[PDB]
PDB file of C-alpha atoms and ligand atoms in Angstrom:
ATOM      1  CA  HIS A   1     114.926 101.486 123.197  1.00 48.33           C
ATOM      2  CA  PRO A   2     111.388 102.144 124.443  1.00 44.90           C
ATOM      3  CA  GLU A   3     108.593 100.393 122.380  1.00 45.15           C
ATOM      4  CA  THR A   4     107.174 102.693 119.801  1.00 41.74           C
ATOM      5  CA  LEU A   5     103.701 103.161 121.197  1.00 37.61           C
ATOM      6  CA  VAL A   6     105.204 103.601 124.664  1.00 39.61           C
ATOM      7  CA  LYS A   7     107.538 106.241 123.251  1.00 41.25           C
ATOM      8  CA  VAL A   8     104.675 108.059 121.442  1.00 39.51           C
ATOM      9  CA  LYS A   9     102.655 108.159 124.639  1.00 41.22           C
ATOM     10  CA  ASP A  10     105.763 109.427 126.503  1.00 41.77           C
ATOM     11  CA  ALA A  11     106.305 112.152 123.950  1.00 37.37           C
ATOM     12  CA  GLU A  12     102.725 113.301 124.547  1.00 37.01           C
ATOM     13  CA  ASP A  13     103.282 113.242 128.280  1.00 35.52           C
ATOM     14  CA  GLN A  14     106.398 115.403 127.845  1.00 37.02           C
ATOM     15  CA  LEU A  15     105.125 117.883 125.319  1.00 37.52           C
ATOM     16  CA  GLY A  16     101.450 118.285 126.253  1.00 30.83           C
ATOM     17  CA  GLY A  17      99.018 118.725 123.436  1.00 29.20           C
ATOM     18  CA  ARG A  18      98.436 115.544 121.299  1.00 27.33           C
ATOM     19  CA  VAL A  19     100.704 113.273 119.358  1.00 24.74           C
ATOM     20  CA  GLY A  20      99.261 111.124 116.581  1.00 20.93           C
ATOM     21  CA  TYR A  21     101.047 108.215 114.956  1.00 19.88           C
ATOM     22  CA  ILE A  22     100.519 105.468 112.403  1.00 27.59           C
ATOM     23  CA  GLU A  23     102.695 102.883 110.764  1.00 26.01           C
ATOM     24  CA  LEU A  24     101.365 101.125 107.624  1.00 25.83           C
ATOM     25  CA  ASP A  25     102.838  98.238 105.701  1.00 26.62           C
ATOM     26  CA  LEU A  26     103.502  99.705 102.242  1.00 26.52           C
ATOM     27  CA  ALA A  27     102.885  96.445 100.262  1.00 26.93           C
ATOM     28  CA  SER A  28      99.580  95.477 101.945  1.00 27.35           C
ATOM     29  CA  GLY A  29      98.376  98.767 103.402  1.00 34.18           C
ATOM     30  CA  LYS A  30      97.673  97.056 106.764  1.00 35.67           C
ATOM     31  CA  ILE A  31      97.921  99.127 109.924  1.00 39.74           C
ATOM     32  CA  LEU A  32     100.865  97.905 111.957  1.00 40.78           C
ATOM     33  CA  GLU A  33     100.717 100.331 114.918  1.00 43.28           C
ATOM     34  CA  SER A  34      98.809 103.473 115.796  1.00 46.26           C
ATOM     35  CA  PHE A  35      97.904 106.108 118.334  1.00 44.80           C
ATOM     36  CA  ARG A  36      95.078 108.640 117.879  1.00 39.30           C
ATOM     37  CA  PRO A  37      94.725 107.365 114.294  1.00 39.18           C
ATOM     38  CA  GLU A  38      91.363 109.041 113.612  1.00 37.43           C
ATOM     39  CA  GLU A  39      91.901 112.347 115.392  1.00 40.30           C
ATOM     40  CA  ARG A  40      92.512 115.521 113.464  1.00 39.16           C
ATOM     41  CA  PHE A  41      95.833 117.401 113.332  1.00 38.76           C
ATOM     42  CA  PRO A  42      96.978 120.426 111.224  1.00 40.68           C
ATOM     43  CA  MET A  43      98.874 119.230 108.141  1.00 39.15           C
ATOM     44  CA  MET A  44     101.181 122.221 107.927  1.00 39.48           C
ATOM     45  CA  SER A  45     103.613 121.809 105.015  1.00 37.65           C
ATOM     46  CA  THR A  46     102.946 118.021 104.809  1.00 40.68           C
ATOM     47  CA  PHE A  47     100.096 119.016 102.453  1.00 43.45           C
ATOM     48  CA  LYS A  48     102.669 119.941  99.841  1.00 45.38           C
ATOM     49  CA  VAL A  49     103.091 116.278  98.898  1.00 44.82           C
ATOM     50  CA  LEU A  50      99.361 115.923  98.285  1.00 45.54           C
ATOM     51  CA  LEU A  51      99.384 119.144  96.197  1.00 46.90           C
ATOM     52  CA  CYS A  52     102.094 117.682  94.003  1.00 46.10           C
ATOM     53  CA  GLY A  53     100.133 114.511  93.719  1.00 47.19           C
ATOM     54  CA  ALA A  54      97.253 116.558  92.265  1.00 46.82           C
ATOM     55  CA  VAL A  55      99.646 118.282  89.871  1.00 50.56           C
ATOM     56  CA  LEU A  56     100.984 114.989  88.702  1.00 49.10           C
ATOM     57  CA  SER A  57      97.475 113.650  88.268  1.00 48.82           C
ATOM     58  CA  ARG A  58      96.896 116.515  85.884  1.00 49.73           C
ATOM     59  CA  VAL A  59     100.137 115.704  84.051  1.00 48.10           C
ATOM     60  CA  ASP A  60      98.939 112.089  83.691  1.00 47.22           C
ATOM     61  CA  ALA A  61      95.595 113.464  82.392  1.00 48.80           C
ATOM     62  CA  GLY A  62      97.330 115.525  79.714  1.00 46.39           C
ATOM     63  CA  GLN A  63      96.296 118.793  81.392  1.00 49.22           C
ATOM     64  CA  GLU A  64      99.677 119.869  82.705  1.00 45.26           C
ATOM     65  CA  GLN A  65     103.351 119.581  81.835  1.00 46.86           C
ATOM     66  CA  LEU A  66     106.185 119.465  84.366  1.00 46.83           C
ATOM     67  CA  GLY A  67     108.283 121.584  81.922  1.00 46.81           C
ATOM     68  CA  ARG A  68     105.748 124.417  81.703  1.00 47.59           C
ATOM     69  CA  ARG A  69     107.427 127.616  82.856  1.00 52.81           C
ATOM     70  CA  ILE A  70     105.628 129.894  85.291  1.00 52.37           C
ATOM     71  CA  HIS A  71     106.653 133.517  85.522  1.00 51.41           C
ATOM     72  CA  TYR A  72     105.533 135.243  88.676  1.00 50.78           C
ATOM     73  CA  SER A  73     106.097 138.560  90.297  1.00 48.81           C
ATOM     74  CA  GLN A  74     107.476 139.865  93.529  1.00 47.27           C
ATOM     75  CA  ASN A  75     103.873 140.511  94.568  1.00 46.45           C
ATOM     76  CA  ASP A  76     103.266 136.758  94.614  1.00 46.38           C
ATOM     77  CA  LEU A  77     106.009 136.106  97.116  1.00 48.30           C
ATOM     78  CA  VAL A  78     104.983 135.150 100.659  1.00 46.88           C
ATOM     79  CA  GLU A  79     106.950 134.198 103.784  1.00 47.37           C
ATOM     80  CA  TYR A  80     109.469 131.324 103.499  1.00 47.40           C
ATOM     81  CA  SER A  81     110.181 131.253  99.811  1.00 49.41           C
ATOM     82  CA  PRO A  82     113.844 130.399  99.658  1.00 49.24           C
ATOM     83  CA  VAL A  83     113.863 129.023  96.149  1.00 49.48           C
ATOM     84  CA  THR A  84     111.143 131.098  94.423  1.00 50.30           C
ATOM     85  CA  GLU A  85     112.504 134.389  95.671  1.00 47.22           C
ATOM     86  CA  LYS A  86     115.643 133.675  93.622  1.00 45.67           C
ATOM     87  CA  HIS A  87     113.821 133.184  90.281  1.00 45.83           C
ATOM     88  CA  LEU A  88     111.947 136.416  89.698  1.00 44.47           C
ATOM     89  CA  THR A  89     113.533 136.945  86.301  1.00 44.56           C
ATOM     90  CA  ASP A  90     113.514 133.411  84.972  1.00 41.41           C
ATOM     91  CA  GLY A  91     110.506 131.933  86.669  1.00 42.79           C
ATOM     92  CA  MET A  92     110.323 128.196  87.404  1.00 42.77           C
ATOM     93  CA  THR A  93     108.868 125.156  85.774  1.00 39.81           C
ATOM     94  CA  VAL A  94     105.923 123.317  87.329  1.00 41.01           C
ATOM     95  CA  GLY A  95     108.356 120.470  88.166  1.00 39.64           C
ATOM     96  CA  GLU A  96     110.810 122.871  89.710  1.00 42.04           C
ATOM     97  CA  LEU A  97     108.018 124.328  91.782  1.00 44.73           C
ATOM     98  CA  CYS A  98     107.078 120.927  93.120  1.00 45.26           C
ATOM     99  CA  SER A  99     110.732 120.243  93.883  1.00 44.03           C
ATOM    100  CA  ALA A 100     110.905 123.571  95.775  1.00 45.31           C
ATOM    101  CA  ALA A 101     107.593 122.978  97.603  1.00 46.00           C
ATOM    102  CA  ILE A 102     108.587 119.459  98.739  1.00 44.88           C
ATOM    103  CA  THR A 103     112.349 119.600  99.172  1.00 45.33           C
ATOM    104  CA  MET A 104     112.590 123.083 100.660  1.00 42.70           C
ATOM    105  CA  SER A 105     109.078 123.652 101.876  1.00 45.48           C
ATOM    106  CA  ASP A 106     108.802 126.739  99.681  1.00 49.13           C
ATOM    107  CA  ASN A 107     105.516 128.532 100.317  1.00 49.66           C
ATOM    108  CA  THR A 108     105.260 130.642  97.189  1.00 50.20           C
ATOM    109  CA  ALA A 109     105.877 127.486  95.154  1.00 50.28           C
ATOM    110  CA  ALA A 110     102.978 125.791  96.883  1.00 50.49           C
ATOM    111  CA  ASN A 111     100.699 128.788  96.286  1.00 53.15           C
ATOM    112  CA  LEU A 112     101.652 128.904  92.619  1.00 53.06           C
ATOM    113  CA  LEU A 113     100.888 125.208  92.252  1.00 53.89           C
ATOM    114  CA  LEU A 114      97.622 125.646  94.135  1.00 54.87           C
ATOM    115  CA  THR A 115      96.623 128.310  91.476  1.00 53.60           C
ATOM    116  CA  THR A 116      97.287 125.707  88.775  1.00 52.86           C
ATOM    117  CA  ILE A 117      94.497 123.554  90.103  1.00 55.32           C
ATOM    118  CA  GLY A 118      92.149 126.328  91.246  1.00 53.41           C
ATOM    119  CA  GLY A 119      92.990 126.720  94.911  1.00 56.83           C
ATOM    120  CA  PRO A 120      92.678 124.845  98.287  1.00 56.87           C
ATOM    121  CA  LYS A 121      89.077 123.690  97.741  1.00 55.09           C
ATOM    122  CA  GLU A 122      90.147 122.019  94.525  1.00 54.25           C
ATOM    123  CA  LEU A 123      92.924 120.152  96.343  1.00 54.69           C
ATOM    124  CA  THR A 124      90.188 118.984  98.778  1.00 56.25           C
ATOM    125  CA  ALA A 125      88.160 117.879  95.815  1.00 55.72           C
ATOM    126  CA  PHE A 126      91.138 115.930  94.397  1.00 55.58           C
ATOM    127  CA  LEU A 127      91.446 114.152  97.750  1.00 55.71           C
ATOM    128  CA  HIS A 128      87.698 113.408  97.885  1.00 59.49           C
ATOM    129  CA  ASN A 129      87.985 112.120  94.345  1.00 59.97           C
ATOM    130  CA  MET A 130      90.586 109.557  95.389  1.00 58.60           C
ATOM    131  CA  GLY A 131      88.617 108.351  98.387  1.00 58.08           C
ATOM    132  CA  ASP A 132      89.897 110.499 101.132  1.00 57.95           C
ATOM    133  CA  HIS A 133      86.792 112.176 102.637  1.00 55.37           C
ATOM    134  CA  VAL A 134      88.704 113.371 105.701  1.00 53.37           C
ATOM    135  CA  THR A 135      91.719 115.437 104.657  1.00 53.68           C
ATOM    136  CA  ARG A 136      90.970 119.107 103.796  1.00 54.75           C
ATOM    137  CA  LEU A 137      92.851 122.161 102.628  1.00 52.58           C
ATOM    138  CA  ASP A 138      91.127 125.521 103.166  1.00 52.06           C
ATOM    139  CA  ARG A 139      93.777 128.183 103.158  1.00 52.22           C
ATOM    140  CA  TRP A 140      96.872 129.296 101.325  1.00 50.52           C
ATOM    141  CA  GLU A 141     100.407 129.785 102.583  1.00 52.38           C
ATOM    142  CA  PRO A 142     101.245 131.087 105.090  1.00 50.67           C
ATOM    143  CA  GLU A 143      97.811 131.249 106.844  1.00 47.69           C
ATOM    144  CA  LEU A 144      97.256 127.439 106.656  1.00 48.58           C
ATOM    145  CA  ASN A 145      99.788 127.061 109.476  1.00 46.96           C
ATOM    146  CA  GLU A 146      97.846 129.082 112.099  1.00 49.47           C
ATOM    147  CA  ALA A 147      96.753 125.789 113.780  1.00 44.88           C
ATOM    148  CA  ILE A 148      93.840 127.275 115.862  1.00 43.35           C
ATOM    149  CA  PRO A 149      93.064 124.512 118.407  1.00 42.64           C
ATOM    150  CA  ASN A 150      90.039 122.509 117.043  1.00 41.64           C
ATOM    151  CA  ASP A 151      89.393 124.398 113.882  1.00 40.76           C
ATOM    152  CA  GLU A 152      89.250 121.710 111.407  1.00 39.89           C
ATOM    153  CA  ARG A 153      90.531 123.762 108.491  1.00 37.88           C
ATOM    154  CA  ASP A 154      93.736 122.419 106.894  1.00 37.49           C
ATOM    155  CA  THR A 155      93.678 119.155 108.816  1.00 33.39           C
ATOM    156  CA  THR A 156      94.057 115.447 108.277  1.00 33.15           C
ATOM    157  CA  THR A 157      94.181 112.391 110.525  1.00 31.30           C
ATOM    158  CA  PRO A 158      97.122 110.027 110.793  1.00 27.72           C
ATOM    159  CA  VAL A 159      95.246 107.213 109.076  1.00 29.38           C
ATOM    160  CA  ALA A 160      93.763 109.432 106.307  1.00 28.26           C
ATOM    161  CA  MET A 161      97.129 110.878 105.481  1.00 27.94           C
ATOM    162  CA  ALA A 162      98.953 107.586 105.632  1.00 25.96           C
ATOM    163  CA  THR A 163      96.312 105.862 103.489  1.00 28.73           C
ATOM    164  CA  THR A 164      96.307 108.705 100.924  1.00 31.19           C
ATOM    165  CA  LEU A 165     100.096 108.795 100.776  1.00 33.50           C
ATOM    166  CA  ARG A 166     100.193 105.087 100.119  1.00 33.52           C
ATOM    167  CA  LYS A 167      97.576 105.467  97.335  1.00 31.38           C
ATOM    168  CA  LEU A 168      99.761 108.142  95.699  1.00 30.36           C
ATOM    169  CA  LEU A 169     102.973 106.136  95.940  1.00 29.37           C
ATOM    170  CA  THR A 170     101.700 102.738  95.068  1.00 27.05           C
ATOM    171  CA  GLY A 171      98.939 101.267  92.879  1.00 27.24           C
ATOM    172  CA  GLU A 172      97.606 103.053  89.810  1.00 27.37           C
ATOM    173  CA  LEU A 173      96.038 106.412  90.703  1.00 27.29           C
ATOM    174  CA  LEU A 174      99.185 107.963  89.192  1.00 27.21           C
ATOM    175  CA  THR A 175     101.294 106.495  86.366  1.00 21.96           C
ATOM    176  CA  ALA A 176     104.518 104.700  87.257  1.00 20.61           C
ATOM    177  CA  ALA A 177     106.587 107.702  86.132  1.00 20.06           C
ATOM    178  CA  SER A 178     104.462 110.101  88.188  1.00 18.83           C
ATOM    179  CA  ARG A 179     104.562 107.886  91.344  1.00 20.29           C
ATOM    180  CA  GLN A 180     108.319 107.757  90.906  1.00 23.57           C
ATOM    181  CA  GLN A 181     108.587 111.544  90.497  1.00 22.60           C
ATOM    182  CA  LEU A 182     106.651 112.115  93.676  1.00 21.17           C
ATOM    183  CA  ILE A 183     108.765 109.793  95.747  1.00 18.89           C
ATOM    184  CA  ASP A 184     111.945 111.255  94.175  1.00 18.49           C
ATOM    185  CA  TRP A 185     110.980 114.716  95.385  1.00 15.73           C
ATOM    186  CA  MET A 186     110.315 113.356  98.845  1.00 18.42           C
ATOM    187  CA  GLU A 187     113.582 111.462  98.902  1.00 20.58           C
ATOM    188  CA  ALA A 188     115.370 114.705  98.074  1.00 19.98           C
ATOM    189  CA  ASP A 189     113.879 116.517 101.124  1.00 20.35           C
ATOM    190  CA  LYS A 190     116.444 118.969 102.490  1.00 18.22           C
ATOM    191  CA  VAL A 191     114.699 120.379 105.485  1.00 17.01           C
ATOM    192  CA  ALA A 192     113.778 117.380 107.687  1.00 17.91           C
ATOM    193  CA  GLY A 193     117.189 116.444 109.007  1.00 14.63           C
ATOM    194  CA  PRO A 194     116.334 116.711 112.704  1.00 15.07           C
ATOM    195  CA  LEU A 195     113.451 114.290 112.443  1.00 17.50           C
ATOM    196  CA  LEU A 196     113.257 110.715 111.233  1.00 17.05           C
ATOM    197  CA  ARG A 197     116.432 111.140 109.156  1.00 16.70           C
ATOM    198  CA  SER A 198     118.391 111.638 112.374  1.00 16.75           C
ATOM    199  CA  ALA A 199     117.591 108.052 113.374  1.00 17.00           C
ATOM    200  CA  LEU A 200     118.004 106.462 109.992  1.00 19.37           C
ATOM    201  CA  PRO A 201     120.622 103.683 109.637  1.00 20.16           C
ATOM    202  CA  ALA A 202     123.125 103.591 106.811  1.00 18.09           C
ATOM    203  CA  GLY A 203     121.816 102.088 103.605  1.00 18.00           C
ATOM    204  CA  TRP A 204     118.181 102.854 104.311  1.00 24.94           C
ATOM    205  CA  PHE A 205     115.813 104.699 102.000  1.00 27.20           C
ATOM    206  CA  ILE A 206     113.623 107.557 103.186  1.00 27.89           C
ATOM    207  CA  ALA A 207     111.219 109.806 101.297  1.00 27.87           C
ATOM    208  CA  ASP A 208     109.626 112.368 103.572  1.00 24.57           C
ATOM    209  CA  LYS A 209     107.985 115.723 104.076  1.00 26.41           C
ATOM    210  CA  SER A 210     107.893 117.665 107.326  1.00 26.08           C
ATOM    211  CA  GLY A 211     105.693 120.402 108.694  1.00 23.51           C
ATOM    212  CA  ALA A 212     106.006 123.035 111.380  1.00 21.46           C
ATOM    213  CA  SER A 213     104.211 125.912 112.997  1.00 18.62           C
ATOM    214  CA  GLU A 214     106.087 128.530 115.116  1.00 21.13           C
ATOM    215  CA  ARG A 215     104.208 127.337 118.190  1.00 19.32           C
ATOM    216  CA  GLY A 216     102.341 124.217 118.968  1.00 16.91           C
ATOM    217  CA  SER A 217     102.784 121.918 115.988  1.00 18.74           C
ATOM    218  CA  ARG A 218     105.064 119.601 114.039  1.00 14.80           C
ATOM    219  CA  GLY A 219     104.723 116.655 111.704  1.00 15.37           C
ATOM    220  CA  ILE A 220     106.232 114.321 109.256  1.00 14.95           C
ATOM    221  CA  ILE A 221     105.053 111.869 106.617  1.00 14.68           C
ATOM    222  CA  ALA A 222     107.441 109.271 105.304  1.00 16.55           C
ATOM    223  CA  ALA A 223     107.963 106.146 103.206  1.00 12.29           C
ATOM    224  CA  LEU A 224     111.057 104.344 104.442  1.00 11.61           C
ATOM    225  CA  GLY A 225     112.830 101.002 104.695  1.00 12.55           C
ATOM    226  CA  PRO A 226     116.089  99.085 104.667  1.00 14.37           C
ATOM    227  CA  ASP A 227     118.195  98.070 101.668  1.00 12.59           C
ATOM    228  CA  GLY A 228     117.415 101.108  99.486  1.00 12.95           C
ATOM    229  CA  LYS A 229     113.676 100.381  99.321  1.00 15.31           C
ATOM    230  CA  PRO A 230     110.719 101.841 101.210  1.00 16.42           C
ATOM    231  CA  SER A 231     108.528  99.220 102.943  1.00 11.45           C
ATOM    232  CA  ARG A 232     106.475 101.193 105.439  1.00  7.66           C
ATOM    233  CA  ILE A 233     104.642 104.472 105.741  1.00  6.18           C
ATOM    234  CA  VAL A 234     105.004 106.448 108.956  1.00 11.36           C
ATOM    235  CA  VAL A 235     102.949 109.537 109.825  1.00 14.25           C
ATOM    236  CA  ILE A 236     103.560 111.542 113.005  1.00 11.16           C
ATOM    237  CA  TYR A 237     101.704 114.698 113.993  1.00  8.68           C
ATOM    238  CA  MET A 238     101.838 116.871 117.080  1.00  6.31           C
ATOM    239  CA  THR A 239      99.748 119.878 117.980  1.00  4.39           C
ATOM    240  CA  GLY A 240      98.311 121.798 120.831  1.00  3.72           C
ATOM    241  CA  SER A 241     101.304 122.352 123.044  1.00  2.00           C
ATOM    242  CA  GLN A 242     103.647 125.083 124.090  1.00  2.00           C
ATOM    243  CA  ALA A 243     106.748 123.001 123.403  1.00  2.00           C
ATOM    244  CA  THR A 244     109.831 124.411 121.819  1.00  2.00           C
ATOM    245  CA  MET A 245     110.909 123.483 118.342  1.00  2.00           C
ATOM    246  CA  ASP A 246     113.959 121.663 119.776  1.00  2.00           C
ATOM    247  CA  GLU A 247     111.732 119.539 122.030  1.00  2.00           C
ATOM    248  CA  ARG A 248     109.255 118.768 119.264  1.00  2.00           C
ATOM    249  CA  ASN A 249     112.123 117.766 116.991  1.00  2.00           C
ATOM    250  CA  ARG A 250     113.733 115.638 119.727  1.00  2.00           C
ATOM    251  CA  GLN A 251     110.511 113.728 120.368  1.00  2.00           C
ATOM    252  CA  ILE A 252     110.021 112.953 116.697  1.00  2.00           C
ATOM    253  CA  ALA A 253     113.629 111.767 116.488  1.00  2.00           C
ATOM    254  CA  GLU A 254     113.130 109.555 119.531  1.00  2.00           C
ATOM    255  CA  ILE A 255     109.903 108.070 118.078  1.00  2.00           C
ATOM    256  CA  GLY A 256     111.954 107.417 114.967  1.00  2.00           C
ATOM    257  CA  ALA A 257     114.726 105.684 116.891  1.00  2.00           C
ATOM    258  CA  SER A 258     112.146 103.410 118.518  1.00  2.00           C
ATOM    259  CA  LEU A 259     110.537 102.565 115.240  1.00  2.00           C
ATOM    260  CA  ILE A 260     113.869 101.710 113.615  1.00  2.00           C
ATOM    261  CA  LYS A 261     115.144  99.673 116.586  1.00  2.00           C
ATOM    262  CA  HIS A 262     111.903  97.580 116.676  1.00  2.00           C
ATOM    263  CA  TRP A 263     111.520  97.295 112.961  1.00  2.00           C
TER     264      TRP A 263
HETATM  265 CA1   CA B 301      97.981 111.050 126.885  1.00  2.00          CA
END
């Protein structure tokens, strides 16, 4: 029931640290609302969507195939690998890995996909190459979550991320089938229930990706809208506090409720 910017400011008051927020119109790309739009925040697992965008760019370039099967070993497994840990014998396809990275936040999957393109610096280069000179990936999972206060590694800004997400989902940087694949994976997110999904009315569409660190940080990127169709991009980041996970989740959910009620 509070106005969305009011609610975002309130969340920051409650949590400490910073909260960043942007809402973009999907069709036009115009900024509808924002708070701290140009300040940096750790991406956490929200980067996984961008990683898959790079993968799909390679598929569209004829340099990768979503059906290519990747065998990996137990030595490749890192923390929070709920899907990849189950496929040591069979491996997983590149498309399966992106599904695991996005829908389940699987870390080994993300590292595997990062190897396909040559590592974090090469994801940065992909972003630079599509006009995003702000967003940067520097580390692998799980270190990219360490969220050291002002250390600009592995960070984006609300506007950079929102703008880049829109460019990946709409327009022609990716083919229609690749744009569609990316949003499908996001729609199938399984691990963001406490966040914007908790506020979502029946019949709405959401495609999202969340991020978390143990302490300090949370975030979500989303394309959502009524009537089965996304019409806006929302990006919310939080960092720099000592808030509990339950309180970070609750604040995101409340920001979501405000955004939906004032749509
Ligand atoms: Ca403040």
